[PDB]
Design a protein around this nucleic acid. Structure first.
Ligand SMILES: [Mg+2]
Ligand SMILES: [Mg+2]
Ligand SMILES: [Mg+2]
Length: 238
RNA sequence: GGCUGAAGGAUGCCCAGAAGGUACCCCAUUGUAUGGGAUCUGAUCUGGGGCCUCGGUGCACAUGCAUGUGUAGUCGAGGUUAAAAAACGUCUAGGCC
């Protein structure tokens, strides 16, 4: 049983040491890891996903690390005649994280009543600090998940269609968190998405947020980041 | 009681179909929302796909270095079916001790 925990230790060590420049030298270590059980694979994917969405800066490296294990079949423990590819498991974690928003507010609502139940000023302030801290923890996760999906797109483990139905989903929910994520995703995938096969559809995305830019109904910071994204588009994504 | 491995399943690729999505467009309510349609898709499921024909090279054989024959998971060259695939970070049926 110590073998699974030792594999987790080595995977976490590699993730901590992983950096863009020294990438290649650690990849041999990644290919030499004995991942042969659905539990080990799920745990390694859990570690990679958590690190990649909790720390967006180095997510690029982690994305490329995932490319080195795009083909790592393992037999499902329940029915040992079935197999699960690493890609199927890593993408399921990504898609599940992407659509938690539908339920996300719910848990805050489940805590929102407590805001009323904290009678005294000390309790009210402590409850308010905890709820906004939770809101920060969630918005930091969603942004990490979006940048990780965008980084996996540049390595072709995804396709243009998932980005085109992720951008439109973020944009249809005109709430602040979604528009911040839309800014991050377009900023990280604009050059690899601005092609002539997607020229018509893209020509509406920005146009839509242009109205947002002109409406000034949302918070300023959102407009500010949208202006940055539109200006980066105007300069050929560089 | 231990070693090994079938293009038999599974995985990957390709094709068909389905759930789902679909900014823009159109139709209805009509409210910029919902529902339906049209493309475009399809992170997900259900199936199907391991064809021919000809050369080069290599190999083996059989005849007199040459010719004929068969073909190496061979390189190409073309056809055919909607589809001509990772000889596969996998499980088995076995096979051996
Ligand atoms: Mg449909
Ligand atoms: Mg199939
Ligand atoms: Mg089949």
């Amino acid at each position: 049983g110590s073998k699974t925990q030792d594999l987790f230790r080595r995977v976490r060590s590699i993730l901590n040491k992983l950096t863009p420049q020294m990438f290649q030298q650690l990849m041999k270590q990644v290919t030499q890891l004995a991942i042969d059980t659905e539990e080990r694979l799920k745990g390694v994917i859990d570690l990679i996903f958590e690190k990649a969405i909790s720390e967006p800066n180095f997510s690029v490296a982690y994305a490329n690390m995932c490319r080195c294990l795009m083909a790592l079949k393992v037999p499902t423990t329940e029915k040992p005649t079935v197999t699960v590819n690493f890609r199927k498991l890593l993408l399921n974690r990504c898609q599940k994280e992407f659509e938690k928003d539908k339920d996300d507010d719910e848990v805050f609502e489940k805590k929102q009543k407590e805001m009323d139940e904290a009678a005294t000023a000390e309790e009210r302030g402590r409850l308010k600090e905890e709820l906004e801290e939770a809101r920060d923890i969630a918005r930091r996760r969603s942004l990490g998940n979006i940048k990780f999906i965008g980084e996996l797109f540049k390595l072709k483990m995804l396709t243009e269609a998932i980005m085109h139905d992720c951008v439109v989903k973020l944009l249809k929910n005109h709430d602040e968190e979604s528009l911040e994520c839309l800014c991050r995703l377009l900023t990280t995938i604009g050059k690899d998405l601005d092609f002539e096969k997607a020229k018509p559809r893209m020509d509406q995305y920005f146009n839509q947020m242009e109205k947002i830019i002109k409406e000034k109904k949302t918070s300023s910071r959102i407009r500010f980041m949208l202006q940055d994204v539109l200006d980066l588009r105007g300069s050929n994504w560089v």
